[PDB]
Structures are given as structure tokens and as C-alpha cells.
Amino acid sequence: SMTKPVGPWQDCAEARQAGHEQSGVYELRVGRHVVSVWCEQQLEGGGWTVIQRRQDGSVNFFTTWQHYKAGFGRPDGEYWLGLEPVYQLTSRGDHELLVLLEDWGGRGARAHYDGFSLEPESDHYRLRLGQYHGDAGDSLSWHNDKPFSTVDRDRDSYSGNCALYQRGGWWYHACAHSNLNGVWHHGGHYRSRYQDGVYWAEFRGGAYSLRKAAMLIRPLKL
């Protein structure tokens, strides 16, 4: 028929190439299961699968290993796609990671990594990145080849428990240049004993909480 091609899709890039130019919720076939994700279809050519998004404090990111593994939140809003789904997606071919940030004054910034994957659960979903470029600054490279930690699974390189103080699940080092799964505060400045906000060291700094943050992936076709 004369209607556009339809899903479910291998990824947002496949939907984009089929002529779906509007961002929104798409169905992806990830492994043996179809999962709904937000696709950013306009920025930098589109085709970006959102795997993490912060924007309004509606979802608790201080949550269980099982929730970090399986995914939590909902794709129309704040969510975390899940370590296992992201492992499945990035276990097939090369991927670019795009990090999108916005501060409370409306300034935006972007980080790109040419290469992004996770080890499986048996290797604690260790992060692998590729070459960096972007205006945001490279505040994820310090987390390369770090295991994923949550408060009951302290795998970081800190004397104490990074997740306990910075409140995310993350590939904590000692402790972080970026904390995108941290506490979303209702303004850029907040009162806390710890740098626990949604921060990016090289874009507004570790004492700031960003208004919007998101992590997106797309197949990398050289």
C-alpha cells in the first residue's frame, strides 16, 4: 500500500530512514522483546534512541540494581532504558553516544563518543566509550572501563560509597565527573552536603544540577 513503513524497528535510525521525522515514542525490537523508547528524530540528523532522560524530577533514580538492570520510568518522560536492554543493543555493531544537556538559563551543550558499549551483567556492565568530541566537555571519559555501581553494589574506586552520596546508579570512579542519574533539583543551585545533582563537570560544574539531561545512542556507520 501507499502508507509509510511501520515498526517495530531495529532502532530509531531505521525508523528515521523510513521517513519518520517526528520525535516521540517508537517500538524497538531489542533481543527477544519489543520495548517502547523515545526517538529524537531531528537533532543531528535524527535516529537517536534515548536511553536515559532527566527533565522534571518525576522518577526516583535512587533505586535498585534490578531496576537499573531492567529499566524504569516511562518513555514519554523521565526514564532509564536499562543496563540489560542497552547491553543487548550495543552488543551488535558500533554505536555513537550523544549526551544532551541544558542548564536553567537555557544554555544547551552536547557530548559525543564514537563508540559506546557495555559488558554483560557478569562483568558488571562495565562502560566502554570511544573518541570524544563536543561543546559540553569530556566529563564521561573518567568513567571509561568502570563497573556499574548502585548503593548496595559498591564497585567504585572510592574509599566510600559513591552511590550513597551522589545517589545514582553509575559507573562511579572516585567519584564522578558526571552524575546524570543523580538528584534532579528544582533549580541549578541546591542545598546538600554532597555534590549529588545531575551534573557534568565541564558544563556548569559539580555543584550544579542541570535542568535537562539525556543520553542517546545511534549505530555508528563509518
3-state secondary structure (DSSP) of residue 17: helix
What cell does 185 get? Answer: 533539583
Residue 83: which residues within 8 A CB-CB, separation 6 or more? 68, 69, 118, 121, 125, 148
To the nearest whole angstrom, how small is the minimum distance from the Cβ of residue 154 to Ca ion? 4
* Cis bond upstream, residue 85 (ω within 30): no
* Residue (154 or 202) nearer to Ca ion, CB: 154
Q: Where are the beta strands (DSSP E) in 119-208?
A: 127-133
Q: Please work out the total of residues on this chain that contact Ca ion, with binding judged by CB under 5 A.
A: 3
Site stretch for Ca ion (CB under 5 A), options 30-38, 132-140, 151-159, 180-188: 151-159
To the nearest whole angstrom, how small is the minimum distance from the Cβ of residue 155 to Ca ion? 8
Site stretch for Ca ion (CB under 5 A), options 14-22, 30-38, 146-154, 204-212: 146-154
Residues 62, 65, 142, 158: which binds Ca ion (CB under 5 A)?
Answer: 158
Q: What is the dihedral sign for C-alpha 62, 83, 199, 205?
A: positive
* Residue (139 or 166) nearer to Ca ion, CB: 166
To the nearest whole angstrom, how small is the minimum distance from the Cβ of residue 109 to Ca ion? 29
Tell me, letter by letter, the H, E, C secondary structure of 56-116: CCCCCCCCCHHHHHHCEECCCCCEECCHHHHHHHHCCCCEEEEEEEECCCCCEEEEEEEEE
* Residue (143 or 185) nearer to Ca ion, CB: 143
3-state secondary structure (DSSP) of residue 216: strand
By the rule CB under 5 A, 103 interacts with Ca ion = no
Residues 44, 94, 114, 154: which binds Ca ion (CB under 5 A)?
Answer: 154
Could you give the residue ranges of the DSSP H alpha helices within 138-216? 162-166
Site stretch for Ca ion (CB under 5 A), options 79-87, 113-121, 150-158, 190-198: 150-158
To the nearest whole angstrom, how small is the minimum distance from the Cβ of residue 96 to Ca ion? 31
To the nearest whole angstrom, how small is the minimum distance from the Cβ of residue 158 to Ca ion? 4
Residues that bind Ca ion (CB under 5 A): 154, 156, 158
